[PDB]
Design a protein around this nucleic acid. Structure first.
Ligand code: SF4
Ligand SMILES: [Mg+2]
Ligand SMILES: [Mg+2]
Ligand SMILES: [Mg+2]
Ligand SMILES: [Mg+2]
Ligand SMILES: [Mg+2]
Ligand SMILES: [Mg+2]
Ligand SMILES: [Mg+2]
Ligand SMILES: [Mg+2]
Ligand SMILES: [Mg+2]
Ligand SMILES: [Mg+2]
Ligand SMILES: [Mg+2]
Ligand SMILES: [Mg+2]
Ligand SMILES: [Mg+2]
Ligand SMILES: [Mg+2]
Ligand SMILES: [Mg+2]
Ligand SMILES: [Mg+2]
Ligand SMILES: [Mg+2]
Ligand SMILES: [Mg+2]
Ligand SMILES: [Mg+2]
Ligand SMILES: [Mg+2]
Ligand SMILES: [Mg+2]
Ligand SMILES: [Mg+2]
Ligand SMILES: [Mg+2]
Ligand SMILES: [Mg+2]
Ligand SMILES: [Mg+2]
Ligand SMILES: [Mg+2]
Ligand SMILES: [Mg+2]
Ligand SMILES: [Mg+2]
Ligand SMILES: [Mg+2]
Ligand SMILES: [Mg+2]
Ligand SMILES: [Mg+2]
Ligand SMILES: [Mg+2]
Ligand SMILES: [Mg+2]
Ligand SMILES: [Mg+2]
Ligand SMILES: [Mg+2]
Ligand SMILES: [Mg+2]
Ligand SMILES: [Mg+2]
Ligand SMILES: [Mg+2]
Ligand SMILES: [Mg+2]
Ligand SMILES: [Mg+2]
Ligand SMILES: [Mg+2]
Ligand SMILES: [Mg+2]
Ligand SMILES: [Mg+2]
Ligand SMILES: [Mg+2]
Ligand SMILES: [Mg+2]
Ligand SMILES: [Mg+2]
Ligand SMILES: [Mg+2]
Ligand SMILES: [Mg+2]
Ligand SMILES: [Mg+2]
Ligand SMILES: [Mg+2]
Ligand SMILES: [Mg+2]
Ligand SMILES: [Mg+2]
Ligand SMILES: [Mg+2]
Ligand SMILES: [Mg+2]
Ligand SMILES: [Mg+2]
Ligand SMILES: [Mg+2]
Ligand SMILES: [Mg+2]
Ligand SMILES: [Mg+2]
Ligand SMILES: [Mg+2]
Ligand SMILES: [Mg+2]
Ligand SMILES: [Mg+2]
Ligand SMILES: [Mg+2]
Ligand SMILES: [Mg+2]
Ligand SMILES: [Mg+2]
Ligand SMILES: [Mg+2]
Ligand SMILES: [Mg+2]
Ligand SMILES: [Mg+2]
Ligand SMILES: [Mg+2]
Ligand SMILES: [Mg+2]
Ligand SMILES: [Mg+2]
Ligand SMILES: [Mg+2]
Ligand SMILES: [Mg+2]
Ligand SMILES: [Mg+2]
Ligand SMILES: [Mg+2]
Ligand SMILES: [Mg+2]
Ligand SMILES: [Mg+2]
Ligand SMILES: [Mg+2]
Ligand SMILES: [Mg+2]
Ligand SMILES: [Mg+2]
Ligand SMILES: [Mg+2]
Ligand SMILES: [Mg+2]
Lengths: 96, 99, 82, 122, 208, 137
RNA sequence: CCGAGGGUAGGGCCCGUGACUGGGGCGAAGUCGUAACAAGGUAGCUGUACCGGAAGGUGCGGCUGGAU
RNA sequence: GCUAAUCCCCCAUGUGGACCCGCCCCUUGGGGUGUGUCCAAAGGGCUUUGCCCGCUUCCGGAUGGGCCCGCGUCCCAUCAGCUAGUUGGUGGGGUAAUGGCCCACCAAGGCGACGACGGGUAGCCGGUCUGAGAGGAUGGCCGGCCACAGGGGCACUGAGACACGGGCCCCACUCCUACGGGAGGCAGCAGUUAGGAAUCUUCCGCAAUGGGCGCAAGCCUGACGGAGCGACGCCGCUUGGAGGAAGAAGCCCUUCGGGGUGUAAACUCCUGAACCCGGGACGAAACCCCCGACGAGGGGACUGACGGUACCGGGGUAAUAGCGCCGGCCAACUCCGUGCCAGCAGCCGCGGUAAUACGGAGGGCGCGAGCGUUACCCGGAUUCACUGGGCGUAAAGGGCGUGUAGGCGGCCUGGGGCGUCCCAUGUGAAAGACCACGGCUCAACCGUGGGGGAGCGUGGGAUACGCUCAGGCUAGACGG
């Protein structure tokens, strides 16, 4: 009727709340920049995409994201903005 | 080494994928007689360049799909429609083994 | 981590350890990477300890960590000498 | 047969049929007696052989020979049975083991007493 | 343990003197002189042709009853001889003669193998300087089988070694009387013994 | 005909049991290389390449033991036994390590190897294995 | 959205069990007849068919593993 | 509501890495480089312009894994047809990562007598048991791998789990309760109950080896090391040794003379399992401590559950024997009793008034702290026959053709080298097995060494035969 396993569980929730919070923003700020790119609206898309890049890697600093998950998440974020902006171009500002 | 096998394209009816029919001979582990056995392989053809009767070589590649684990390597011989006829006659003969 | 360990053999009241490099999490008498010697803590026979020192230096050089008793059996064999 | 037939069909590994199926792969099986009676044997023997119809812990209900001179078994006697037919009592494929459960040993036995649940006397 | 029963009925059944008593076996009182027929009720009834399984069983009991050894060990030692290099008959005999209690008897420290066994089990015999109280201990070429210091001043081995001064022990052996020690030089060849046994039949016995 | 080699092993077997002077075999190169073995090893006096009704054959000259005494004076055979081993229905290949001795060396084994047709003693000399064609003694 | 499972409905396989019913094996000295074994007193066997307390009988065609 | 930090965010720096678009090498996403953007942190202890444990980013090593492929892997065909995420494609989601793994749409595919699908059974291997081998049988102990943690579903935290002694939910069951409500998961170690022919101590200690955390002293460790019960198994040992009569008594047999148990006993002497006394272990020298340099190398110290056991020495009592069997197979026979009864029986068979076969007794044979029995595996069984069988009458030729698949195929020349043969090389873990040697007094048990393969990966080679391709022939076959 006890353990140090109960402490590992109390901690797992402090981290779960923290990991879910970071992923929510990553998906929000990223998708936000992909809609903006489709409109394009390039300075606005790229000004947001960069904060989506920053949040991604800042998550890989710890346990929220593996290095490769972030690098793959970054790869698809940028790749979608390129083609989307190829229609109705003008990439200004710059981020690639 | 990536296993490399040689066989014949028995069916090209798919997109970017052919069916390569490979045979292999070996002695019976007890009766010593050499016997043939066969196995079909779904091989990748991204250029849809291979047709029925081609005698191709496949190389053990990374998964293209479930069951697709070989890429077609090189054509060795074209037009062996005699072998595909041995295959189809065998399959057609199966309706005669019913109840 | 890789560790340098004594995997007991022999029989009841009859110890005979093998000088072995094995994973830290492998069970004591389980499968090991290499056998680099042996040991007879009672010294009942003329050569109770033997060590392939050239090999024990390799695993020492590549990462493996000894035990507080395996270490004294590699120092007793002069793996650490100058 | 031709070697090509052996390739196609092989050799059939024969299977053996147990002689003690009520035992369920065990050396012995406990049961209780329903009918304890005598039975006459087949040609060319004549006698009044004592058997018991035993209902087993394996669900089966079989007949079991009661060896030796004299017994103490009746209905509701707990018993242990062993493998062993009686060549001349058809359908009796088992023996009750003497000196176990409610089968007494054999009184005044002196030879082979181990085969009759009889202990050693002074 | 070993057979601790009457011993003359043994020779009587086998039909040949098995020198299993020491002194008594050389006197007219030996029961093989007086009644040389099998013991029990039917000994003096005239024998029938025995089966060939009987012939081999009898040769194999003779050999075993010579050394007073249990069938388990006698069969154990047979199987080591069998799987050994080549000639089984010689090796079974040599491994039999390699037993310590037997060697004590061949050296003359004891007058009978039964007594020899007791000289060992009571510790009175050492091997290369250590008390070795095991009847089945395997003596090998080189060892020195002696009498213990706290034992050499005991009537039995004194008298026994006395009559040994008059005896000439087997070639494969050595004996220094008065020092009460001997040496096992080499395991015997085939003809080193004239054991009343055809060991080839003993092989035939177990090959059935 | 389905096994020209077993046919020749059998033509000779049947010819020696009636003590015929010779027996003709349909001619082929592989059969020469086998009769080459049989002659050099003493089992036959030899052979010659002949022509029967226009077609190439091989007249094999057989050999027998001395006339014996008793009932049945018929002489002991020089080829006691000549038996197909590898057959069209089951090929038999032995590497060099598992080449059989035929009758504790008093008989021969003819095999086909990538160094030619050899006897068992010839095979281990050249250190090669092959297809066990037949055993003879 | 998926989702353990719960519910409704309809199938398939297997096991056990059932008044009664079919024949089967077995069981020292039951009742009936005598089909087969000798040409077994109608040569036998046979597929089929029909009949009869029971073996069996008879038809058709077939076999000799049928006698003189 | 207050509050600390190796907890948490922001800025900065960018050795560096990541990402996107370019070019270069390479060739599946491998490596380079340039532009843009993006991401680092934590401090603590002592003797202090100095070390030590920690921290951060990147590279490499090492170890541990994930995934994919060839091949091998049981019974029923009285299971013959199976398939809609089904098979492939495009896009995407997902992950460390490939993939129908997941989603949308597109195409109409995928599989199967070389046994698909279904039903049955089963964890698999190193090995074990048998066997002349071939083979058969088996997978407990030990080691490797997998699978599960009351029955299911799920994810979270994390390098790593979809986690036995973690979390959520549904179900079945059980329990506490103050009756309002709450709790649990022994297939961990003991132990209980039930089932069963049947399977252990609610023991001791972390001293050793090993694990976790720690600078370290150390702490935890039912892993483990040992102790306990069980002839369950194997091995070792004892219940005595020598002497002792033409031979006690008792018992059995007898032709009534005698024969047997039987040197067996008694009895004489000798030794001295047990038990009594004393001494008393190896397993344990490292970590730490000193000098040196917290190194190398020297030297010092403490620590034993098992155990006051093994063993050593000294004393010292003749000190458990039983079980099966005696008609043939198959080793060992007479008397009585019984009278197809009572009973025996692995098979053939014994018993009906002279039973070596039932029961007892004497005697005898085999083993011996065992001996018998039952169950099951292999062998004998060449009785599934690859080694190594058969089919006129013993069981066995399809009623007969025709023909699909398939198996098999004449003579000569050559090209290849698939089979096949050879050489080299990698793999074939440890344990086991086998041989040599050694340690427990021996042995079982155990250490150390040695020696091999088959099978597969790779490199080189041979080309007779089998294969293939090509060319020629006419003896098979077919036609005029
Ligand atoms: S006394 Fe005679 S019968 Fe008795 S054991 Fe000695 S030799 Fe044998
Ligand atoms: Mg949102
Ligand atoms: Mg990370
Ligand atoms: Mg012990
Ligand atoms: Mg591991
Ligand atoms: Mg009778
Ligand atoms: Mg009951
Ligand atoms: Mg009662
Ligand atoms: Mg009996
Ligand atoms: Mg005596
Ligand atoms: Mg044998
Ligand atoms: Mg045998
Ligand atoms: Mg080979
Ligand atoms: Mg559902
Ligand atoms: Mg449902
Ligand atoms: Mg529910
Ligand atoms: Mg009447
Ligand atoms: Mg009639
Ligand atoms: Mg009649
Ligand atoms: Mg008639
Ligand atoms: Mg009549
Ligand atoms: Mg008729
Ligand atoms: Mg009529
Ligand atoms: Mg920054
Ligand atoms: Mg799918
Ligand atoms: Mg879909
Ligand atoms: Mg569609
Ligand atoms: Mg196949
Ligand atoms: Mg099941
Ligand atoms: Mg199972
Ligand atoms: Mg055999
Ligand atoms: Mg298996
Ligand atoms: Mg098991
Ligand atoms: Mg589960
Ligand atoms: Mg449970
Ligand atoms: Mg479950
Ligand atoms: Mg659960
Ligand atoms: Mg799991
Ligand atoms: Mg856990
Ligand atoms: Mg638990
Ligand atoms: Mg509630
Ligand atoms: Mg609640
Ligand atoms: Mg709960
Ligand atoms: Mg218990
Ligand atoms: Mg019970
Ligand atoms: Mg510890
Ligand atoms: Mg404890
Ligand atoms: Mg007298
Ligand atoms: Mg007398
Ligand atoms: Mg008397
Ligand atoms: Mg008398
Ligand atoms: Mg003491
Ligand atoms: Mg110590
Ligand atoms: Mg006594
Ligand atoms: Mg017996
Ligand atoms: Mg016997
Ligand atoms: Mg006899
Ligand atoms: Mg039996
Ligand atoms: Mg009478
Ligand atoms: Mg009579
Ligand atoms: Mg009588
Ligand atoms: Mg009997
Ligand atoms: Mg009997
Ligand atoms: Mg009797
Ligand atoms: Mg014993
Ligand atoms: Mg058998
Ligand atoms: Mg035999
Ligand atoms: Mg067999
Ligand atoms: Mg059979
Ligand atoms: Mg055969
Ligand atoms: Mg036969
Ligand atoms: Mg017939
Ligand atoms: Mg016919
Ligand atoms: Mg028909
Ligand atoms: Mg054809
Ligand atoms: Mg062909
Ligand atoms: Mg050919
Ligand atoms: Mg090749
Ligand atoms: Mg190997
Ligand atoms: Mg190995
Ligand atoms: Mg060993
Ligand atoms: Mg070894």
């Amino acid at each position: 009727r006890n353990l140090s396993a109960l402490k590992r569980h109390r901690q797992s929730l402090k981290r779960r709340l923290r990991n879910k919070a970071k992923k929510s923003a990553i998906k929000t700020l990223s998708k936000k920049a992909i809609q903006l790119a489709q409109e394009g609206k390039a300075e606005e898309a790229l000004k947001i995409m960069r904060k989506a890049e920053s949040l991604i890697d800042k998550a890989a600093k710890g346990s929220t994201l593996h290095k490769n998950a972030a690098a793959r998440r970054k790869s698809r974020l940028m790749r979608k903005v390129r083609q989307l902006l190829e229609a109705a171009g003008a990439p200004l500002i710059g981020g690639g | 080494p990536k296993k490399v096998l040689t066989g014949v394209v028995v069916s090209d009816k798919m997109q970017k994928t052919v069916t390569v029919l490979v045979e292999r001979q070996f002695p019976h582990p007890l009766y010593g007689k050499v016997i043939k056995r066969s196995k079909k392989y779904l091989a990748h053809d991204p250029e849809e360049k291979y047709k029925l009767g081609d005698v191709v070589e496949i190389i053990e590649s990374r998964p293209i799909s479930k069951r697709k684990r070989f890429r077609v390597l090189r054509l060795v011989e074209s037009g062996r429609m005699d072998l595909v006829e041995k295959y189809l006659i065998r399959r057609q003969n199966y309706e005669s083994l019913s109840k | 981590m890789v560790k340098i360990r004594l995997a007991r053999f022999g029989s009841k009241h009859n110890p005979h350890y093998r000088i072995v490099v094995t994973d830290a999490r492998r069970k004591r008498d389980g499968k090991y990477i290499e056998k680099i010697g042996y040991y007879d803590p009672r010294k009942t026979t003329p050569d109770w300890l033997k060590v392939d020192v050239e090999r024990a230096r390799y695993w020492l050089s590549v990462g493996a960590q000894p035990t507080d008793t395996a270490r004294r059996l590699l120092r007793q064999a002069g793996v650490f000498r100058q | 047969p031709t070697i090509n037939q052996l390739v196609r069909k092989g050799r059939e590994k024969v299977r053996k049929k147990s002689k003690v199926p009520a035992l369920k792969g065990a050396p012995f099986r406990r049961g209780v007696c329903t009918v304890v009676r005598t039975v006459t044997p087949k040609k060319p023997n004549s006698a009044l052989r004592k058997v018991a119809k035993v209902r087993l812990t394996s669900g089966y209900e079989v007949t079991a020979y009661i060896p030796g001179e004299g017994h103490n078994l009746q209905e509701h006697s707990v018993v242990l049975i062993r493998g062993g037919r009686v060549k001349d009592l058809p359908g009796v494929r088992y023996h009750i083991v003497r000196g176990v459960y409610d089968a007494a040993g054999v009184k005044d036995r002196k030879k082979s007493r181990s085969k009759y649940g009889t202990k050693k006397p002074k | 343990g070993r057979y601790i029963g009457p011993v003359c009925r043994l020779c009587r059944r086998e039909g040949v003197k098995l020198y299993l008593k020491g002194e008594r076996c050389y006197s007219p009182k030996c029961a093989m002189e007086r009644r040389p027929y099998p013991p029990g009720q039917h000994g003096q009834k005239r024998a029938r042709r025995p089966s060939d399984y009987a012939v081999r069983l009898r040769e194999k009991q003779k050999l075993r009853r010579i050394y007073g050894i249990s069938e388990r060990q006698f069969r154990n030692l047979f199987e080591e001889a069998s799987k050994k290099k080549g000639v089984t008959g010689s090796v079974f005999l040599g491994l039999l003669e390699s037993r310590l209690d037997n060697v004590v008897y061949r050296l003359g420290f004891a007058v009978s193998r039964r007594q020899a066994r007791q000289l060992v089990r009571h510790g009175h015999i050492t091997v290369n300087g250590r008390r070795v109280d095991l009847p089945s201990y395997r003596v090998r070429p080189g060892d020195e089988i002696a009498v213990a210091e706290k034992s050499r001043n005991l009537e039995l081995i004194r008298q026994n070694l006395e009559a040994m001064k008059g005896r000439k022990v087997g070639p494969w052996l050595s004996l220094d009387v008065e020092g009460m020690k001997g040496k096992f030089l080499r395991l015997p060849d085939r003809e080193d013994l004239a054991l009343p046994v055809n060991e080839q039949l003993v092989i035939e016995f177990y090959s059935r | 005909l389905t096994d020209p080699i077993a046919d020749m092993l059998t033509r000779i077997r049947n010819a020696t049991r009636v003590y015929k002077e010779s027996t003709d075999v349909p001619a082929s190169r592989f059969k020469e290389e086998i009769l080459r073995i049989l002659a050099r090893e003493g089992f036959i006096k030899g052979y010659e390449r002949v022509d029967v009704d226009g077609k190439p054959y091989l007249r094999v000259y057989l050999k027998y033991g001395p006339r014996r005494q008793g009932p049945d004076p018929r002489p002991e055979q020089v080829i006691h036994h000549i038996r197909r081993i590898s057959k069209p229905g089951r090929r038999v290949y032995v590497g060099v390590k598992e080449i059989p001795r035929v009758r504790r060396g008093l008989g021969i084994a003819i095999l086909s190897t990538s160094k030619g047709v050899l006897t068992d003693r010839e095979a281990r000399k050249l250190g090669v294995g092959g297809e066990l064609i037949c055993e003879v003694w």
